Amino acid sequence: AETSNDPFLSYVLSSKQLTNLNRLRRKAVTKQLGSSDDNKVSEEFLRYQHTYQREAFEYLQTKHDAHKIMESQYEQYQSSSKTRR
Amino acid sequence: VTGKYNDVIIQRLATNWSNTFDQKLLEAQWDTQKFASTSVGLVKCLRENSTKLYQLSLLYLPLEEETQNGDSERPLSRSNNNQEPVLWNFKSLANNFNVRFTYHFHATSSSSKIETYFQFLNDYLAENLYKCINIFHDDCNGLTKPVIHE
Amino acid sequence: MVVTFLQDLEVLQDALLNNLQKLSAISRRKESGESKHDEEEEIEFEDLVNIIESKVSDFESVLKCSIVEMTYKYPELKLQWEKSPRYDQCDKLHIVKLDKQMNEDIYAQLVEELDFVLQFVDWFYCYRLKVKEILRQHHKRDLAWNDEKRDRAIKFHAVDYDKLHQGTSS
């Protein structure tokens, strides 16, 4: 059974969650640094990677694995086309 | 009273019955080419004796050994040794090898003699592991491959 | 092309993800139940591991370097990277000092840099967690795969035993 992946839509969803993560992190460090309490770390700052760290890492890893599976498929198609030529 | 039961009854009866069963095993010479494996009658008798003796073994009522010495500094009290009920079936199996080792290596152990022992175990193992597996393995005795092997 | 420390970070991270995909592929390879009908594959795993540790030293190194660079870029900022003494706890980036009169454009630039470096330190915390997870994964798979090879040799020797002769005259 040939493993069909179509890592495209999974890459899309991973980029979706990735930009979500990135804007959440941006707003979080915005609230933190712009945090007027220079002596207290906001629960939002901590909570970002208390809540999304594993999600961010798994999503990024899935993105890279999907892009690498896709680019392996791509070099495979490239090699098969060049050998076909 | 548990230890008294485990000696005067489990260990004593087990030692007698094991002397008997090892007697029957050496009378069978099971781990030999001379052993009449076609004697399915004798194979069944020895299989039933192994069954009975191993069941009697499983009748070792575990000494509730006081699992004491729970400390931190450096007790590391792991002296279980997995003391199993006396399996002089399993022990007598290699008693011929014990005689061969004691007589062949009767001299004191030297550093080189250690590797001699090791290669002796290796060759005896090669020639007898699956031989004895063929002879003594009795799936009907609740003897699976992991159980028998280990 | 002055290669910013974050650029080195992202290139090294991209390489690290390459290596993670590779070693995870090796793990799932050994999770395939393959018989020699493995050794240099193990060797390649060790080499890739030592690569992971070289690159992780480089990563934490350039990471500290970027931290220092940030600290010396802006005067008012006092950042301190406190490595978590415990696995279950993330590392810490306590911004100790910041004067709110800094230029807004430079403010947002520092914001974006802090954003990237926080992403990096947390992704690196999760990456160290993940490599610990995957080496424990590999060793657990070694304990399970030596045992599965034990059981496969036991089953093959068992069926060989069984087909040889087991008193089949009854």
Token representation of residue C150: 């034990």
Gap between the Cα atoms of C143 and C155, Å rounded: 18
Q: Which of residues 54-83 of A touch C (CB under 8 A)?
A: 54, 56-57, 60-61, 64-65, 68
CB contacts < 8 A, B to C, total 21
Which CA distances in Å does B91 have to A35, B42, C18, C29, C49? Answer: 75, 20, 55, 42, 46
Note the resolution in Å, 1 decimal. 4.5
The upper half-sphere exposure of residue B38, i.e. CA atoms within 13 Å in the direction of its Cβ, equals 2
Structure-determination approach: cryo-EM
Mutation target to probe the A interface, by most A beta carbons within 10 A, among C114, C116, C124, C132 is C114
C95 SS3 class? strand
Gap between the Cα atoms of C95 and A38, Å rounded: 7
C153 SS3 class? helix
Neighbours of A85 (CB within 10 A): 5
Nearest Cα to C132, choosing from C43, C42, C32, C56? C56
- Is C touching B (3+ C-beta pairs, cut-off 8 A)? yes
Helix axes A7-33, A53-84, angle to 10 degrees: 140
CB burial of residue B21 (10 Å; 0-12, 13-18, 19+):
buried
Gap between the Cα atoms of C152 and C149, Å rounded: 5
H/E run at residue C11: helix C5-30
